[PDB]
Every structure is written in structure tokens, then in C-alpha cells.
Amino acid sequence: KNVTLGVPRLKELINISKKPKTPSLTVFLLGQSARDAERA
Amino acid sequence: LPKMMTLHQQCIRVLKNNIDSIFEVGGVPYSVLEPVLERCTPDQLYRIEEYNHVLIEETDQLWKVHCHRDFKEERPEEYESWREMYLRLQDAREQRLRVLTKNIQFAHANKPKGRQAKMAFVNSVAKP
Amino acid sequence: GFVGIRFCQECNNMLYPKEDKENRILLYACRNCDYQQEADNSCIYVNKITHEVDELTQIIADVSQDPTLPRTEDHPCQKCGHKEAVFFQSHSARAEDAMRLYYVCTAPHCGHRWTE
Amino acid sequence: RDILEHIIYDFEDPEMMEMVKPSLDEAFVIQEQNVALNFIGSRGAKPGVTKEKRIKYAKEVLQKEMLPHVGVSDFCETKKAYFLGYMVHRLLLAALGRRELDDRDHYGNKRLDLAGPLLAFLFRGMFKNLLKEVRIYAQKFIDRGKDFNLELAIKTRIISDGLKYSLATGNWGDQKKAH
Amino acid sequence: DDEEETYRLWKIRKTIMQLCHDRGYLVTQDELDQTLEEFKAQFGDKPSEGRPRRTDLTVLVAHNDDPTDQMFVFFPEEPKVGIKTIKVYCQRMQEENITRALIVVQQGMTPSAKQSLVDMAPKYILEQFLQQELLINITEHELVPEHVVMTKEEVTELLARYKLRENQLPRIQAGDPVARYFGIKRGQVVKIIRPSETAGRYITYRLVQ
Amino acid sequence: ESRGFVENSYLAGLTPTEFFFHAMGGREGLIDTAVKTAETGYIQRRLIKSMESVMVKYDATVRNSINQVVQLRYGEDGLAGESVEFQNLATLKPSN
Amino acid sequence: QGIEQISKVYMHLPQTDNKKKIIITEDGEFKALQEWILETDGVSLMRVLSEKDVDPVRTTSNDIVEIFTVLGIEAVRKALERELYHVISFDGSYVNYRHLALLCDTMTCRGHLMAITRHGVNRQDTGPLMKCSFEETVDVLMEA
Amino acid sequence: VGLVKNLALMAYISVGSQPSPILEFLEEWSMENLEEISPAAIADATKIFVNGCWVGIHKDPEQLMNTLRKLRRQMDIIVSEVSMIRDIREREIRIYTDAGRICRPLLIVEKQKLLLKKR
Amino acid sequence: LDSFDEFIQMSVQRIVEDAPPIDLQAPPRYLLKFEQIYLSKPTHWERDGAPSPMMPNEARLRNLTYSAPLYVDITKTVIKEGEEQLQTQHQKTFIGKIPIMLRSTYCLLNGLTDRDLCELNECPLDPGGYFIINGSEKVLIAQEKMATNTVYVFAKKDSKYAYTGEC
DNA sequence: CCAGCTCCCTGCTGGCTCCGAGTGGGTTCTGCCGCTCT
RNA sequence: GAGGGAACCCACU
DNA sequence: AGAGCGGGGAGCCAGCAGGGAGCTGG
Ligand SMILES: [Zn+2]
Ligand SMILES: [Zn+2]
Fold first, then answer.
1. Contact G71, E177 (CB under 8 A)
2. Domain E1-136: top CATH class
3. Residue (of I39, I111, H81, H15) closest to D115 by Cα position
4. Structural fold of domain E137-209
5. What is the 3-state secondary structure (H, E, C) of H33-44?
6. Among I69, H62, C24, G93, which Cα is nearest to B127's?
7. Ligand 1 ion: nearby residues, β-carbon < 5 Å
8. How many angstroms separate the CA of I100 from the C1' of L7?
9. How wide is the angle at C-alpha G127 spanned by C-alphas G121 and G132, nearest 5°?
């Protein structure tokens, strides 16, 4: 993951940017899907 | 060097590092001397052949490896061994280069005229 | 396989694919002049999306004369048995996924290029 | 065939053919030199109303102003065509990934204008200005009069004060165009 | 596929009825926690065949304090929604004297249909919902704190306590997803309860603008 | 060695390639300082002008110049930040 | 297959407690559970949330605008606080919570995302003199 | 920072030269002009650029570069500040005589030996 | 010093040559052609008008510009109707003053030993390489530019072009 | 039956405004050379 | 007991 | 004759063309 931090991310935060440099999600899984790697 | 070498290989690798050390081969046949002479350059072959003349008629095929590396567009004509062809073309190319140098120096500096600024010493009153 | 440009002869322009339904076959026709020609290969256009696995055919033998290239004597030439060979990685944009080494024989008049 | 011979040097290379196919397809509707010169002159700085004026303007752009280094004289168009085809070939090589892109920060792609070239640029502009003012003065004294004195025609203030101004201020150009 | 569309319909119905319970409508505990198997048993298995039909999926609920205050949830079969479907739905609302409805669309509504909704909003309140929006309950997300719609007496007591005007409160848009969830109109105030790093609990108030 | 690993110490002294690569590395830090100053200063100016009139009022609420409520209590607890300290909750972590 | 806006998905099993599933056991301790979590290179948060076996509670984006359009203004206030805290505390630096909370409350007080820019600040109900003090002085005074 | 630079001590910026001697030498050192060749010969030959002008092609680029280096090293037809680059992989020889090229003197090494001797 | 010497010896004359001759018609035709430049050593003319060899310390102290007069040879041909061409040879016509780089070829300190420089109140360790403009020492900072006549292919980002070749 | 024509969504292109704070010191240029008229 | 501005360049933290 | 004076990027916004429902009309 190449997530941007520091001053460019602060600029992307306080300026509400419709085009962030590295947009991303953190997807969490429910149940057994989170426990084994194959169904993940 | 994680390598084992027998006496042939030891002598020819040492001699393959210092070809330049050879003045006179003594009485070694070319078939023994075949490796160190193939990793070599034509001026050193001329040195070896003009100190060790008896090798000359043996080394001619070797010169082919040089000729197709230095005169790759060429082929021998008949009654032309590769050594004499390489020396004839080598000296012809050096003479062509020397004639071109003596042309494009004479016909570019002495023959034509180029224009540049000359010193005035006028001290003109045109700017008073 | 790839398809190349087939050229007209009357005006030396480009031939475009077309069909005839009377003969019901494929022909390359010139549409600057009125030239037509029956097409040899049925393949009109081909993608090569994952057909970049080869890089040996773009290598030339002249890189044996490059003094900045690494030389090895542990990879003898298969075609002529010369002990020395230059090796280098691929210089393409397809080389981001591979640090694969290619070898070129440094003996003149041979120019044999291989891989590993 | 001639255009692709100027662009693609090995005709046994199919991917270069594949990438030059769209340009050939786009420019098929023009098939003559004069029609292409008309198409060029239609997009000029000021498109002339006369088609022959557009032909002259397009020829002047393609000869005098298109790649002056390979050739600017008349009938030097094959060298210009080989150079333009080499540019297109380099573009296709970069497109294939067969050649690496050039680096702006690579310092062999840079030249250093020292005092020589910079002063030459200045003196070229100011000698053009001096010839312009000499032309105006002599035009005035051949229009109403008959003769002009050449020593009074030349304004030495142009070259002198322009070099002095550009070296004194550092603004490399003209005094009225310092911004 | 019939199975994934049945799962979609069950999730939409569960989120709708969680919304109706959150809006104060009387929705019994039996039909909040309706499992996928119970939804399959009551409605069907093959929506493309038509055992669960979207027209049969219409939900009628009544509000807790006022049993005559009822609201519909309609499920159009067509992916878009035009003026004709709106006219049919509001005719059903008129003949069943009901002034509130939710419309769960698949793809969207036409701009003319949204214009019809905002034109008839003085008489009948009709809410647009995408099925994509309703596939989860956004109020159960960890980022979304607790929203409570305030009564008018609570709003007047709030403004009397803090000596405020309505425009001095923080704002929430009427098109906000939680605002659309709770079905709140302009002028209402939402009390937001959230945890606090410093105080433990913090209550914000947001006027609908 | 080719790609910029300096195997020497500052006491030992750098090889010429290591010296040039170290200069390449330090130029990055100089550039980062010089080009980050302006963007950071613009960020500070924009942050100040967005919040300069936000203040704690006498009813202990936090309001801007329009007298709109930003926070009902400052920091949601009404406390100044120059007297709060790091402490530990004793009943959060241990088991029942 | 998949969702159009998401180019790449990076699976990983986190070894740190920052992105784990903390649970309270039957004995009553906080136990960290290592569970597989995904990252994306694009943002299509609503479709991901709607997907099967994806946690519709803890799944979040780093995109402020889509969090605002999907979950609302208080959720984007909390997301803004979390992302600002991440930027600040990447270095181990600590800023007191009230300053971050005040910045996020300023940016989310009027129901939408008010950017810290002239297009956020100079469109409020503040006076013309404050707006011309910030930026676009002549334009603001002509509008006034 | 980075925009204003300084010269190294032995760096010398080239002053410029006329391409005419190099062009004449290339014309009668077996380089064929662009005007007199069919394009089919360009595929296997080496393009020759003089100040960025494609002037012809050569069939034997290695001995041509050896000859050009020999001419420059003895201060013949080619003057010392002329740069000659053989792009071996791309089959190009670029000769630059123009001003503004920054260069530096280097000792010449032939067969792992300096040509600088004790004499 | 090398760039200034190349500019003075070669570039000024080449610029004068590449300038086209002036053809002027009302009618009488006048063709003006600038032929050969002449550059003197840096001389000063006072209000009296007597030339003097102007020294660099004199230029620095008196706030003079250390410049040399640039003369040129001009030919004016007259083309009338029913008349032959008429030649006027205006030899060594003053057209301005070129500021001179210190210790260059056309500077007055050129070729002088250290003793001669000390007798002229000049520092022999002083490198030259600068001009004296109104008594102020001015150095020309070298300017980087992209190389000419070379094909450079880049990839323009966030544009309609995937790749672009530039010359 | 079915062709006809008007008014809100999206998208592209152009304008438009922003780009750290505070200090020293310097040089140059403003403010120009043809006049028409006595 | 205090009569220019502007532009540019260098430098400082 | 000679003194004095007129003549680079990066990211917002709105304004246009293209679409695509949908009422009135035959
Ligand atoms: Zn044809
Ligand atoms: Zn081999």
C-alpha cells in the first residue's frame, strides 16, 4: 500500500479533495470469511 | 579462481595474460601455441611473426579471424594468403587516412578563406 | 501470428481488407485506385496481449562490442564454443516483471544470443 | 510505401505497421501534395483567402520553419523527410517500450549558454534593429528626397546602449520589454 | 441470479423495517430479525420467476403513538421510475388515505419524477431510496453516531436553555444519508449522541437546512 | 556499492562514488526543507483564517464571529488544554 | 467480476493492534484477534459495504467525500478526526484532542464539508472585511 | 537550491566548431549519403548524426568509431572538444560539435593500461 | 574567456553576414551590404574628443563602460534606370561599442606579465572573465537550456498525448 | 395506431485565483531623441 | 532636529 | 540658433454542447 501521509495528505484533508492521491478502503470481513485466507 | 588446471591450461592461461612477454618461441609447434595466439591482436602477431618467422605459414588461417573482424566486407583474391592481404589493406587504409588528413587540413585551412574580426587601431573621431 | 501491411502495385498505397460474397472469400483491395487482390492469410487483425515473453529477437550482436556491459567466461557459447559472453537484463518496458539475463557471444562472426 | 520507408526501416516488423495503421487511416482522404499543403495552410497563423497563398505559406512553414537544422534551402526535402521519419520512428520505439524515454534532467541533453551565445543573441537582435532603423532613415530620404548620408543613418546608440543596458541590469532582452 | 436477488430483497426488507422501527412506526420484533430462510418461506425463492414479487413486497406500517398515521414502502418492478408509477402509487395512497411512502428503486428515478415528488410534497411525502443505498443500515456503521429526532417541545426547551436561535445551531443537510434515513424535513433538530475522547459522552444538535 | 550503499563510516571516509551518492541523498533533504516551507506556511495561513474568530464565550460555548455554535463545550469537556494530563483508567482493561 | 472503481485489492493479516478486531471475552479481557483485512486502490465504499461477508460496521474509506456522501455529516466528522489524527501521530507526535475536534467541527458545522480554502471559508456568512482579509480581496469587496 | 550550480574544477564547456571537416571526412570514409541510398539499407546500417543532422549511414560502425577516436586523439581533422557517441544498441553514431557541451579530461586506458607513462 | 573570444572573432562577423542586404526602392534602387567588421581596443573619448587607451582601473574608478568600438565596412550600390551600378565603399563605419570581457583577447590586459599588471594597478591573480559596465563588474552567469537538434521523446502525463517527440 | 418537439442531467472546456515569515546589502531606471519654429 | 518610488539580483535565519 | 514641451502548476467555478425522459397532437 502506497498511502500518502504528511503534508500532502494534510493538504488533501483540509482541502476537501474530490481526487485524493491514494484513495483506499479498509475492508473488514465477517465470520469465518475473516478467519481463513481462502475465503478472504 | 575456483578452477583446476592441468599443465597445458596453466601455461596457456599465464601466457594468455602476458602475450606481450613473448619475444622468441624457441621451437614450440603452433599446434601447441594455438590457444594463446587466437586470443591476440594483429600487431602482436606481426611482432611474433617477425621474431619467429618459422611460424608464418602456420598462422595464416589465424589471420582470417582478424580479417573478418577488421575487414569484414572483404574476401581474399587468389594468390593472397590472409597475412599479406591484412598487411596490404591495413597499410592501404592507413595511407588513405593520412592522405585524407593532409587534404582536409590543407584544403580547409590553407586553401579557402574564412572571415573574422581584425584589429582596427583607427581611434576614429566617429565617436567624439 | 502477426499480420503485416500488404501494399498495392498501381499506386503503392495500403490495401484494406474486404470480402466478396460472389466468390465468398477475402481480398485485400486498394481504395485509392481500383486495384484488388485475393488475400492469402485469413487473419485480419491480432492482439498480442501476453505475447511479450520473447526479447531475444530484438537483441543485436553489436552489443558484444559494448565496453560497459558485464562480461563472463562461465557461460560458453552453444553455437560456437567461445568462452566469453556479455550478459545484460532486458531494456524493454516489459522488463519491469523480469530481471532475466540475456547473453551474447563476444566472438566475432558468431553473434549468438541466448538466455540463461 | 514511401512514407513508411521513411518511417519504418525494417518492413519485417509488424507492430510498427500496426501503430502506423491509424495515422494512414486518418490521412487517407488527402492523397496529393497540394491538397496536403492546403490542409496545412488552412491551420496557419493567418489563413489566406487565396488557395495559392495558403500553398506558399505552407511551403514556407515546411521549408524555412520546419526543422531548420537538417535543411533550409530549396530541394533539401529528402533529408527533412528522413529526419521526420526518424522522429516518428523514435516515437514508435518509445510507444513499443523498445526504447527508453528521454530524461530532461540528464545533463547530456543540456547545453550551457555562456557569454558567447548570450551576447550573440543580443547582438543579433540589435543588429537587426540597427538595420531596421537604417532602412527607415534611407527609405525616408529616398521617398521625398534622392540621397541619404549613411553615417547619419546609423544609430550607434542601439548596439551600444542595448549591450550596456542588458549587461548593467541583467534583463536579457530589450529595454521596453524587460517584463 | 435468483439466490443473490433473493438475498438482496431480504437485505432491503430488513433495512427498511429497521428504518421503520427507527422512525417510530410499529414494527414487531418478529419481523425485525426475519432470517433469510424465513423470508424465503414467506415470500419465495425465484424473483425472476416471480415467487417473491416486488409488488407483493410492499410494506405497510403504522406509527406507534398514532395508529392512523401509516406509511407505505413500495418496491417498483421497473429499474427506473417515471410519472406513471408515481401516479399509480399516489392513487393507492389516496384510496388508502395515507400521506407517507418510501419508494425503493433499483436504478433511480427520472428527474421529472423527482420533480413530481417535490411538487406533491405538501400533500404526500414520498422518499426516494436506491436499493444500493438500502443494502446496508448506515446507522449501524461505527462512524455514524446515535441520531435522535427531537420533538418541537424539546427544540424549544433547547433554544430556551442555550438562548439560541435556530440558525445558530450546527446544521445537517436534508439530503444527508442519516437525514434521509430518519425522514426529517427542514426545520427539525437532530440530537446526536456520540462518545468522547475527553468527556466520555457528547451531545450535538443539528438543525435540518 | 553501485546503487548507493555506503559501506564506510564517517571516520573511515567515503569512496568517491559513495561521496557522490551521499551528496545525492543530502540534496533530497535540502530540497524537502526548501519546498516544504511554502506549502506548510500556506496551510498555516488557511487554517488560521478559517478559525481565527472561533472562541470560548461566557456561557462556556464555542462560537464563531457569526455567533453560531461550533461546540457546546470546549473540547466537549469545557477544559483548557494546558492543564490536562495523561492518566490511566483502572477499570477498563482488567477482567471481571 | 468485482467493482469498477477498485483497481487492486491487497489482502493482509495485521500483526499490530491498530487494525485488529478487539473483543471482550467471557472472562472479560480485551483480546486482539488477527483477522484478514483488505485494502483497495480505489474507492467504491457503498458497493463494498453492500457485499456479502463484508463487515458493514467497521469497513471504512480514507476518502472524505465518499464517506460524507454515504454515511453523513457526523460520520465524516469522525472520519476527518481519524485521518487528521493519523497524519499527526504518524511521527509519534501528539496534539491535544480539542484542537483536532475544533478543526473538524469547524469544517462540518454547516451540514456539508467546508474546505479550508477560499471556496469554503469565503462562502460563509462572515463579514466582507474578514473575507477580503483572507483572500480575493477586490472580488469580495465588489460582491459586498 | 539545486537550480544554481557550479562548475567542477576540470570541467570545461565546449566553445563550438564547424561540422564541415567531420562531414567531408565522413563523406569520403565510406559513409553513404541519405540522398543516394534506398531505405532498405537503413535497417542493418548505423545512422550517423552530425550536430543532430542525420547525414548518412555506415556499414562498419566499429572501425569508424575507432578511426574517429584516433583522429580526435592526435588532434587531426576532429578537434578535441568534439563529442562522438556510439549508441550501439540503437545503431546510431552522434557527433556533436556545437557549443555548450560540458566536458572533462580523462586519461585514456588501452588494454587495462594507462597511456600516461613515466616519460 | 573562450566563449567571449569566439563571440568577438566569429559570432559578430557571422551575425553581420547572415543579416540580409537592404534593398530599397521608392525609381532609384539602393543596396546596402555590410561586409567586414573591425573591432578596436577599448578606448575612451572625453569631451575634448582625443582617444586614449582606456584601462580597467580607469573604467572602474570613473564609472566608464570598458567597451571597444566596433567598425564595419559597408558597400552602397546605386541602381538607376539607364545607368550602371554605382559603388560607395564606406570603410570602417562606426556602428556601436562592444563591452569587452576582462583579460580576454581584446582586453588591454591580454598577454601582459604579472609585473605589467602590477604596474597597471591590476591584480595578476584576478581571473578576468567579467565586464565593466558603468564602473560595475558584471559576470554573465551561464544558462542551462535543452540541447538543440536532438530528438527527445517524453510521456506527457494527464494529457491527450501518450508520448511526444520533441526537436 | 405513432411521429413531434422541450427541458433537466452529465461531461468538456475555458477562466480564475492561490502559491511561508522576517531580515540585510547591492545596481539600474524613472525622466527621450525626432522636432517645428524664429 | 529630517524629501522619491519601482524593478531585479545576491545573501541571512 | 536655441529653450521648452507634446507624444510554472493545481484545483475551484460557471457556461456551452450533447444526451434522454415525457407532455401535447394527430
Ligand atoms: Zn492502388
Ligand atoms: Zn559464439
1. yes
2. alpha beta
3. H15
4. Eukaryotic RPB6 RNA polymerase subunit (3.90.940)
5. ECCCCCHHHCCC
6. I69
7. C 8, 10-11, 13, 30, 32-33, 35
8. 36
9. 65
Estimate to the nearest angstrom the gap between the alpha carbon of H24 and the chain centroid. Answer: 14
Report B:19-78 residues touching H (Cβ under 8 A). Answer: 70, 72-73
From the CA of C14, the nearest ligand is 1
Are D159 and I144 in contact (CB < 8 Å)? Answer: no
Residue B14, by phi and psi: left (phi above 0), alpha (psi -120 to 50) or beta? Answer: alpha
Distance, in Å, from the CA atom of I158 to the CA atom of E8, rounded to the nearest integer, reads 39
Cα dist from E14 to E20, E22, E38, whole Å:
10, 12, 12
F70 in G contact zone (CB under 8 Å): yes
Q: Is the dihedral of CA E135, E140, E141, E145 positive or negative?
A: positive
Q: How far is the CA of A8 from the C1' of L11 (A)?
A: 14
Q: Where are the alpha helices (DSSP H) in H10-98?
A: 20-27, 61-73
The protein residues having a beta carbon less than 7 Å from any atom of strand K are D 169-171, 178; H 4
Residues of H in contact with B92 (CB under 8 A): none
AA letter at B2: P
Measured in whole angstroms, the distance separating CA F42 from the mean position of its chain's CA atoms is 15
Method used to obtain the model:
cryo-EM
Q: How far apart are CA E173 and CA G109, in angstroms?
A: 11
Give me the sign of the Cα torsion angle F59, F63, F67, F70.
negative
Dihedral of CA atoms F7, F11, F15, F16 in degrees, nearest 10, equals: 130
Resolution in units of Å: 2.9
CA atoms within 13 A on the CB side of G136: 14
CB contact under 8 A, D69 and I94: no
Distance of alpha carbon A9 from alpha carbon I35, whole angstroms: 65
Percentages helix, strand, coil for chain G (3-state, rounded to 5) are: 45, 15, 40
Domains of chain C: 3-47 (no CATH), 48-116 (2.20.25.10)
Nearest ligand, CA C81? 2
What does the domain layout of chain E look like in residue ranges? 1-136, 137-209
Partner-chain contact I142 H13, CB within 8 Å: yes
Is chain A in touch with chain F: ≥3 Cβ pairs within 8 A?
yes
Cell numbers 560502425 correspond to H61
Residue type, D41: G
Distance CA D85, CA D81 (A): 6
Within 7 A of a protein CB, which nucleotides of strand K? Answer: 7-11
Q: What angle do CA F38, F42, F45 make, to 5 degrees?
A: 140
Integer distance in angstroms from the first to the last C-alpha of chain H? 45
Quote the longest CA-to-CA distance of chain G. 68
Measured distance CA(G109)–CA(G125) in Å, rounded: 13
Beta-carbon contacts of residue E108 (< 8 Å; ≥ 6 apart): E79, E80, E81, E130
Buried b / exposed e along D57-91 (16+ C-beta atoms within 10 A): bbeeebbeebbeebbeeeeeeebbbbbbbbbbbbb
Shortest Cα–Cα distance, F88 to chain H (Å): 48
Of F64, F71, F95, the CB nearest to G28: F95
- Grid cell of G135 as nine digits: 483572500
Helix F16-51 with G97-107: angle, nearest 10 deg? 60
- Show Cβ contacts of residue I26 under 8 Å, excluding neighbours closer than 6 positions: D142, D143
Q: What angle do CA A8, A10, A12 make, to 5 degrees?
A: 70
User: CB of D10 within 8 Å of any CB in chain C?
Assistant: no
List, in sequence order, every residue forming a beta bridge with E200; answer none if it has no partner: E196
Alpha helices, DSSP H, located in chain I: 2-6, 12-18, 56-61, 114-119
